[PDB]
Amino acid sequence: ATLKTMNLEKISALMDKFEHQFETLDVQTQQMEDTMSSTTTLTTPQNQVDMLLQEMADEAGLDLDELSQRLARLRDQ
Amino acid sequence: FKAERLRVNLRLVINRLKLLEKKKTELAQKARKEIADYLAAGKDERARIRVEHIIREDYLVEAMEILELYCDLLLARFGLIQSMKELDSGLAESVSTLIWAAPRLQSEVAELKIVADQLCAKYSKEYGKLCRTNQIGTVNDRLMHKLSVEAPPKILVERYLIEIAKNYNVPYEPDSVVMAE
Amino acid sequence: FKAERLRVNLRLVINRLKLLEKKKTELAQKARKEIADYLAAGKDERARIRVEHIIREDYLVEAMEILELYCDLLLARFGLIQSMKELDSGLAESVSTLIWAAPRLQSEVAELKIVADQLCAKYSKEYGKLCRTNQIGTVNDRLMHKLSVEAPPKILVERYLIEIAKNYNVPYEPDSVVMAE
Amino acid sequence: SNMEKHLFNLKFAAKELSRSAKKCDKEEKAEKAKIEKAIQKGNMEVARI
């Protein structure tokens, strides 16, 4: 009864649907990642976290503005 | 019309433009890293389009800065424009540019649309849904070009790529065909 | 039509193509082991068809990369195409290739079909259910070949087998009849 | 009257923000310690987050 109801073809289709659904869910998660990283950007700069990581790496002992100004120069050129 | 509404909305536009400028700057700084990474993995045209996004965003930032300047000028001379019925030579450029840019940035900032409406309903000489379209032919050329929608020159993009590769300590072989012209 | 819908769907297609590219790469790396094992157990033609699957998947990956490039270009010039009614020379290739590939990858990615529809309902010159079929004769040849459906050349398959056997430290006797031609 | 209760609410929100800042400070300390104990094991992304 079960196999007649839940055949192999139905299984394959259902599993493919599962896979595609969760791929779509990954896309959703990536979309939310991008947005949340864009929103909370003033409260979480990059330079600060970089400096903290470098300092704490030097401590734990392991190795790992002018740019925009020059781009402005190019824009003026 | 209501003048205090215009004044308040101008202040709000100023503040919103400040915040958006800072935010766009941060996002650009964070995306340049991605551009470098794409450059450091074979992909070259991809990073090219990314830096195209970047330069467009930076033009937007510059346009917003100029717009904030004009808005602050208008907020300063508010007392002058609130009395006279016809605008002067000093405010003509500001008003024209602002009314022309309102529909351009209506998505990023909304108060700008209200400002444009207040200015349209305030003036009648060459002002309106159709009269403004013809009377906005004296807006700032610099801002008009920065806020325009056109593919930047490939040489500028190539130079941006070269520089971004230099700063991030990564190689990049710019196309000689573009570097020549 | 709705433009914001197109923009959002383009971004979604980009992200989905990125993820699918990474996933396909991992799957290929995991299947090359199986191909080697089949080679190390007498079976040769079996591993041949398996590597055929692999090369087809890799062509798919390359096509998806190019498609992502074109989608990002379109997302960049969105501001330009959103105003003009007729496409330009720069976006012609991208639009044609994307509309031609939409029904090809409609299974792997769905948003691509919506993008193609928005572009079809947006343009009218040589655009439609039938006009597009004739106006899509300027799509990228490279992508057209990569995404095509044809048995790859046996010499390429033999070279893939030789290399996969070399890397996995296993022997393989390629057919001289194929290595000669 | 209404002004008095509103003042009470204002001061409540003030000290609430104060204690929330203190909470964020101690959480910063905790995260700084967690990154220390995590970087030792060779995790770069965990440390970054």
UniProtKB/Swiss-Prot annotation, chain A:
Tissue/organ expression: Widely expressed. Expressed in pancreas, kidney, skeletal muscle, liver, lung, placenta and brain.
Localisation: Cytoplasm, Cytosol; Endosome; Late endosome membrane
Region feature (Interaction with VTA1): 65-77
Annotated stretches, region: Interaction with VPS4A, MITD1 and STAMBP: 65-75
Consequence of changing L71A: Abolishes interaction with VPS4B
Single annotated GO MF: identical protein binding
GO CC, one annotated term: lysosomal membrane
Keywords of the record: Cell cycle, Cell division, Coiled coil, Cytoplasm, Endosome, Membrane, Protein transport, Transport
Region (Interaction with IST1): 32-56
Record region (Interaction with VPS4B): 65-77
Motif annotated as MIT-interacting motif, chain positions: 65-75
One GO term of the biological process aspect: membrane fission
Primary location class: cytoplasm
Transmembrane intervals: none
Quaternary structure and interacting proteins, as annotated: Probable peripherally associated component of the endosomal sorting required for transport complex III (ESCRT-III). ESCRT-III components are thought to multimerize to form a flat lattice on the perimeter membrane of the endosome. Several assembly forms of ESCRT-III may exist that interact and act sequentially. Interacts with CHMP1A. Interacts with VTA1; the interaction probably involves the open conformation of CHMP1B. Interacts with CHMP2A. Interacts with VPS4A; the interaction is direct. Interacts with VPS4B; the interaction is direct.
Protein function: Probable peripherally associated component of the endosomal sorting required for transport complex III (ESCRT-III) which is involved in multivesicular bodies (MVBs) formation and sorting of endosomal cargo proteins into MVBs. MVBs contain intraluminal vesicles (ILVs) that are generated by invagination and scission from the limiting membrane of the endosome and mostly are delivered to lysosomes enabling degradation of membrane proteins, such as stimulated growth factor receptors, lysosomal enzymes and lipids.
Stated name of the protein: Charged multivesicular body protein 1b
Protein's organism: Homo sapiens
Curated annotation (Swiss-Prot), chains B, C:
Location in or out of the cell: Cytoplasmic vesicle; Cytoplasm, Cytoskeleton, Microtubule organizing center, Centrosome; Midbody; Nucleus envelope
Residue numbers bearing the Phosphotyrosine modification: Y38
Chain spans, region Interaction with CHMP1A and CHMP1B: 1-163
Function: ESCRT-III-like protein involved in cytokinesis, nuclear envelope reassembly and endosomal tubulation. Is required for efficient abscission during cytokinesis. Involved in recruiting VPS4A and/or VPS4B to the midbody of dividing cells. During late anaphase, involved in nuclear envelope reassembly and mitotic spindle disassembly together with the ESCRT-III complex: IST1 acts by mediating the recruitment of SPAST to the nuclear membrane, leading to microtubule severing. Recruited to the reforming nuclear envelope (NE) during anaphase by LEMD2.
Assembly and interaction partners: Interacts with CHMP1A, CHMP1B, VPS4A and VTA1. Interacts with SPAST, STAMBP, and USP8. May interact with VPS37B. May associate with the ESCRT-I complex. Interacts with MITD1, in competition with VSP4. Interacts with SPART (via MIT domain); leading to the recruitment of SPART to midbodies. Interacts with SPAST.
Family: Belongs to the IST1 family.
Name listed for the protein in its UniProt record: IST1 homolog
Species for this entry: Homo sapiens
Lineage: Eukaryota, Metazoa, Chordata, Craniata, Vertebrata
Gene name as annotated: IST1
Span of the entire protein shown here: 6 to 186 of 364
